[PDB]
Structures are given as C-alpha cells and as structure tokens.
Amino acid sequence: TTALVCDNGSGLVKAGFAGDDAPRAVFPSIVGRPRQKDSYVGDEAQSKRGILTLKYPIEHGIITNWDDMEKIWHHTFYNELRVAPEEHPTLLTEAPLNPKANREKMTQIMFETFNVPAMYVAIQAVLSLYASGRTTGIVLDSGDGVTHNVPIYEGYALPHAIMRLDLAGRDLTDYLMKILTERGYSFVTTAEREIVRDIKEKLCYVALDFENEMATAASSSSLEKSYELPDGQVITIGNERFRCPETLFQPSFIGMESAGIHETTYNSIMKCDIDIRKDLYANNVMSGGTTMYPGIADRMQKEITALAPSTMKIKIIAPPERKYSVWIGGSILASLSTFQQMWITKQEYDEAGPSIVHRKC
Ligand SMILES: Nc1ncnc2c1ncn2[C@@H]1O[C@H](COP(=O)(O)OP(=O)(O)OP(=O)(O)O)[C@@H](O)[C@H]1O
Ligand SMILES: [Ca+2]
Ligand SMILES: [Ca+2]
C-alpha cells in the first residue's frame, strides 16, 4: 504494497494510506526543541509549547528547513502512521512553482534517509483538481500560509499563469483577533490566537454582498452569535463573522495592495491560451481550509460573473471535502492502475540521482 500519501502544508500535515477516504493523521507542521527528549513534533510540540522553541519548516507552502522537515516526515511514518517507509511507495505533495533544488532535496531525503522503494511528488492544486473528478480547470488553493491560482489543462499546471498571494488562514486569524480586540474584547496572546482560530472556523462566513451585510449588522442583532471561551465567559461575535474572510476579496483590509481572489482568478485565466479559457471558467475548483467559509462559492460566482464576458458559462465547484482534497487527489492517483509506471523507483534513483524528479514528476 500500500502506498503512503503525505500532504505537507504550512500549517498542517495530512497523511495516510492510498485508498483510504481521508487522511488518518492530521497534525500541526511544527517541531519544538527545549528552551525532555531532544525534539517534539505535531500536537505534542503544541501542547508542550511553553517549554519549547517552535519552528515551522514549511513557509508559504515551501520547505525552508530540511533538518526539521526530516523530523516531521519521520514522526509521520514512525509515530502517526506506524509504518516502515522502506516498505511503501510514498507520494508527497509540493507547492506550485516549487524550486528545482527543493524537489531534488525532497527526493534525496526520501530515498537516502527513509529508504523508500519508490516515490513521487505532485503539485497540491493538481491533486485537488483530480479529487474533483476532472483534469482541466482552475484551482484556487488557500491554506494557512499561502493562496494560489493554478490553471491546469489535461492534467498539467500552466506555470506562466500561476498566481501566488501571501494572504491565507493565519492572516485571517490575526485580523479576527484585531477586530474583536477593537470591539472591546482582548485577543492578543498565543493561547488567544488558538481560541480565535476556533471562532473563525466555527462562526465566520462570506457575505454575498459586504455592504448589505454591514447594514444588517448595524441595524439588528440577527447576525450575532454567542461563543463560549474555555473559562466559561460568553462573548458576542457580530459583523466580524463576515468582515474576517472578506479580506480574501479585499486584501486592503489588512494593508495588502494585492488583487482579491476573484481578480487573481480572472487574471490567471487571462494569462492562458484563449482557446482553453472557457474550460477554466466552467471548472473553478476551490481547495484548502481557507476556502471553507460558507457563502464563498456563491460570492465567487457573483464576482467572476461581473468580470467575465456576458456570454460566459461560469461554475464554482466547492466540495465539502476541500480541507482534505489535496490528500484525496494523492490517494486516488497513487491507487490508479495507470499511475504505477510513473513512480520513481529506488533503482531509477540510484542510477540518476535526485534530479530524476524533474524528468519523472
Ligand atoms: N471551516 C473552516 N473555516 C475557515 N477556515 C478554516 C476552516 N477549517 C480550517 N480552516 C483554516 O484552514 C487553514 C488550514 O488549511 P490547510 O490544511 O489547507 O492549510 P496548509 O496546507 O496547512 O497550508 P498552506 O496550503 O497555506 O501551505 C487554517 O488557517 C485553518 O484555520
Ligand atoms: Ca496546503
Ligand atoms: Ca485593494
């Protein structure tokens, strides 16, 4: 045999076995060292954070710390999945526009450190598209650290048209802390950040129209929701519920001058060959945890419709599984009969070295 699928994100690792419906292990992408054992990984590092210095080896989707990434992978195999990686083909994921040296190092580590019999690296957005049951479309993938638009045709990403936006879930969490503090609460500490992340994931939503929603919130309590803090205090969340994710559509709310996600989607489509643009408009797939806000699909449909030609058929696909669709795509790909010739084998590695990844992946 059974292949392993490891989707390594800025915030969370999603890992499991090809053929499972969902990842067995989902844990924070963190390694902590004493300010016992020599290091801790994942939730244990999080729970023991008070006595550790934490490192986050994936930044904006890119692996930036190889010693700590090795610790994350080792923890995934040995602790979380209870597998010997030398016994399983292993499929890893990577960010769009991942540098060649980076994919080489991933490959080197899998074969030399973990002794895998075979491996493959796939682009996260491409896997998400596969999970949606198609090979052509444009993915908006938004996680904890980065957002990308990735147009894909007949299974392959179109690098010249990929858009990267360094605004994602962590920025939204921080903004929600800020605006709840402005309301008169105080959310400033590291523990309070975790609480506000929960508030964000439970109560936020994307308004179909920002102004209408602000007006409703100003003139009634109909949008207000209660939230109980760990210690039992009950607070009220009002327009913050939709003001937080509104930032995706209007990054200026946090002082970023970037185009919002509807505009980046349009701009990415317009970088592609005119002949495939209708295929992209008709197959906008949302992926990643920061696309989980209720209302986001209807809002994207509205905004893209306003930008596109009047005759254009537009469809937003926002699967309920989209927190884990990258992982699911890896699972179905690794399981597919026609994929089995595509693995990089140990022999292929021994006879080419790490740069085999550019040819095979
Ligand atoms: N229901 C929800 N509503 C809003 N945000 C959510 C929801 N569920 C999870 N998130 C957010 O999604 C992010 C995690 O998503 P994901 O696992 O896709 O990111 P990642 O792969 O770790 O990061 P990246 O793709 O940026 O490298 C977090 O910021 C989390 O708070
Ligand atoms: Ca991700
Ligand atoms: Ca702006």
Side-chain angles (χ1 to χ4, degrees), residues 250-252 256 258:
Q250 185 48 261
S252 296
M256 293 186 177
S258 171

Side-chain angles (χ1 to χ4, degrees), residues 114-135:
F114 296 108
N115 297 302
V116 300
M119 91 83 78
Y120 194 90
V121 169
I123 297 170
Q124 291 143 7
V126 174
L127 294 179
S128 279
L129 188 70
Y130 295 166
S132 78
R134 75 208 72 213
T135 62

